[PDB]
Amino acid sequence: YVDVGPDSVKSACIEVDIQQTFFDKTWPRPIDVSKADGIIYPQGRTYSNITITYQGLFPYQGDHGDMYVYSAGHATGTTPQKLFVANYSQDVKQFANGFVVRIGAAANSTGTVIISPSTSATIRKIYPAFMLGSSVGNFSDGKMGRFFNHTLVLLPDGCGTLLRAFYCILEPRSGNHCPAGNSYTSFATYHTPATDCSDGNYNRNASLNSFKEYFNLRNCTFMYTYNITEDEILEWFGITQTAQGVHLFSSRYVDLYGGNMFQFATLPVYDTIKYYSIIPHSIRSIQSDRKAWAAFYVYKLQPLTFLLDFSVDGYIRRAIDCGFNDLSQLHCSYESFDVESGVYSVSSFEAKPSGSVVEQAEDTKIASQLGNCVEYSLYGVSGRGVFQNCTAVGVRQQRFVYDAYQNLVGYYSDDGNYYCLRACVSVPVSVIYDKETKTHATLFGSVACEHISSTMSQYSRSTRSMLKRRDSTYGPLQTPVGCVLGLVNSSLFVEDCKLPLGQSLCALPDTPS
Amino acid sequence: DTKIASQLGNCVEYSLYGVSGRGVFQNCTAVGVRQQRFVYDAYQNLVG
Structure with missing residues (x-):
């Protein structure tokens, strides 16, 4: 074994008193990926001033x-x-x-x-x-x-x-x-x-x-x-x-x-x-x-996809955590740090399922739950969705009612009731980006603002906090196209914003730079 | 094993610490971070 040298001579140790309450401080230090904080340089290679995508172990952008x-x-x-x-x-x-x-x-x-x-x-x-x-x-x-x-x-x-x-x-x-x-x-x-x-x-x-x-x-x-x-x-x-x-x-x-x-x-x-x-x-x-x-x-460290901005000297100076935001997703999709102005579709919210509903006569509290978005098991048939009590359609005895694409349309249960099954409501998302002012806003489609909130139970990826720096001070705004955040009802009439939202709505910039 | 560690400019086969290929070498101004040796482009071709 290794030559460790002498063992300790004194038997007793100096006493250790725990004073932990004195050390309670709040000096948080979030990672700044645009300053390349915490970036581990790639192994065995170097690059010129070109930007590349890269896969490797990195800290989250939001980690304090x-x-x-x-x-x-x-x-x-x-x-x-x-x-x-x-x-x-x-x-x-x-x-x-x-x-x-x-x-x-x-x-x-x-x-x-x-x-x-x-x-x-x-x-x-x-x-x-x-x-x-x-x-x-x-x-x-x-x-x-x-x-x-x-x-x-x-x-x-x-x-x-x-x-x-x-x-x-x-x-x-x-x-x-x-x-x-x-x-x-x-x-x-x-x-x-x-x-x-x-x-x-x-x-x-x-x-x-x-x-x-x-x-x-x-x-x-x-x-x-x-x-x-x-x-x-x-x-x-x-x-x-x-x-x-x-x-x-x-x-x-x-x-x-x-x-x-x-x-x-x-x-x-x-x-x-x-x-x-x-x-x-x-x-x-x-x-x-x-x-x-x-x-x-x-x-x-985490297995994440990043943009890396190498300098002319081969040093990483900026980076983008691709999954952190919808804005970050766009930068990664176009492989750039200067995306053109427009309205862009991004990843949708899933829904987030609730507690499971199980029926299988042959464990005892949730045999039914009429209407939410739940996982289920029905005599070995499984999936997830919203159940609704509705008028009978198919031949009872055969239980499972299907459409032409073999999706479970509905179910006859052991309580004698027919339940309609409509899966769950995902929420489409798009973002409005103007490159010149470097500002953004978002649109949730035709879902309506009754189903929209300042934080979401529905989940897609990481956060929308870049919007919420201003948009958590406002209610959601209902428009003819959809529910939006940060859009402000100005009631102006403008010939062309270069950022139309469909119908007759237009996303005007705040006064240009 | 000891005569052709360099040959500045022709079209040669090469081996550099287990990396192999062929090409023309030219002495030029430094670009990437020395210590990491191999400089690549966005399509993973050995630039220098």
């Missing part, structure tokens, strides 16, 4: 992320005391095709100390620590997140210039406040800047040793280290896993300023990751010497 903040622990007077940390050790997540993170975003600004927030200390970048593995479970004290067999460990040591990676078995310790002891609270790691991080000799074992104080390193199959340098700039990092092993990505090695991720490193581990957690960390800084740290964010 999960936010975590590291802080200094307890100290008083001129000395360190007990650790005062967030409850992040309990935050076990289901791994889901990798994730990406944003680091140091609030650098070159000020924040608060959090645990003693009234100080209003300036904030600086701090690097995250992580644990990944195939299985989790309870600690001996019932605490969440004990990892089993071998686990991945990612920790910076001391100052941000050194990163270490491990694949090893963790061993619980029987000391005071330690994982096999009965005084255990929560695992955490720490850095002690008063003696660590010396300017002529940064403590390259600092955080690993504080890690070792809670978990012994046994059976270690992989260890790697990486060289980093200090910089206040925002950084991107990510993790994915394939049959080739874990892949590590970063912006730092290649694209420090644009922020596109590149294939920084890979790992030999072929064990599939099922679970992921963040290792909580704290600083053992002296009470007067406290320094606040910039917020840290995590976003999940």
Whole structure:
């Protein structure tokens, strides 16, 4: 196995007190895909200033992320005391095709100390620590997140210039406040800047040793280290896993300023990751010497279709999340960032089915539900639709009434009633776009505004929120063509808007640019 | 294995780290992101 060096000498662990309520903050950071936020650059290829479609793992455009903040622990007077940390050790997540993170975003600004927030200390970048593995479970004290067999460990040591990676078995310790002891609270790691991080000799074992104080390193199959340098700039990092092993990505090695991720490193581990957690960390800084740290964010990767706007230098500068909006769908369908003005049909709303209705004499509450849009099963015949009580048509005894295209028109039930079956009402959608003002509006067809609402139970794709920035302040408007949003009854008479809606209606622009 | 690692401009068969094809090479101004090596067009032909 790997030469881990010495085991920890001290038996007892420094006590960890959970101060999680101090860390409740709301500094959300939605992905800006038009700035290429979170974009992982394509593997093994480059391009010129051409725009292409691409398929790969990406963050959702609407994702605000999960936010975590590291802080200094307890100290008083001129000395360190007990650790005062967030409850992040309990935050076990289901791994889901990798994730990406944003680091140091609030650098070159000020924040608060959090645990003693009234100080209003300036904030600086701090690097995250992580644990990944195939299985989790309870600690001996019932605490969440004990990892089993071998686990991945990612920790910076001391100052941000050194990163270490491990694949090893963790061993619980029987000391005071330690994982096999009965005084255990929560695992955490720490850095002690008063003696660590010396300017002529940064403590390259600092955080690993504080890690070792809670978990012994046994059976270690992989260890790697990486060289980093200090910089206040925002950084991107990510993790994915394939049959080739874990892949590590970063912006730092290649694209420090644009922020596109590149294939920084890979790992030999072929064990599939099922679970992921963040290792909580704290600083053992002296009470007067406290320094606040910039917020840290995590976003999940997803198998999505995107436009990518490559620069003349091969860098991705803009991107479009194709499924995010109806407007985004049009940009992807024409492969462009500058679609011509017009009225365009887009994907329709489905309906969204309710609870199932089942009849099958041979389990007891919903044998009927007269009129909605439900899934059903009728003696092994299945489908979905709206039932309505109506006048008898076909020969009862044979039950199922069909049309010439073999669709179930109706049903004679075991209550003696004939029910008409009309499937469900999908709602067609089109959007009005003007390129010159870069504004838009929508039309729902002849369905009528009685069935339209500010949020929808019916579902197609993601959201219509780009319209709703103005259109959630208005009612739907009934017109002769259809129900619309954002259209305003001006009652003007205009010869030609170049955006006719049919009949005699016309979608006039707000006064041109 | 050691004599024709380059031949600047004719019409040659080539192999570049397992990528193969044939064509004329010409020394020209840099375009794509170096590190990724292979520059492609929208139809996935090796531009450079």
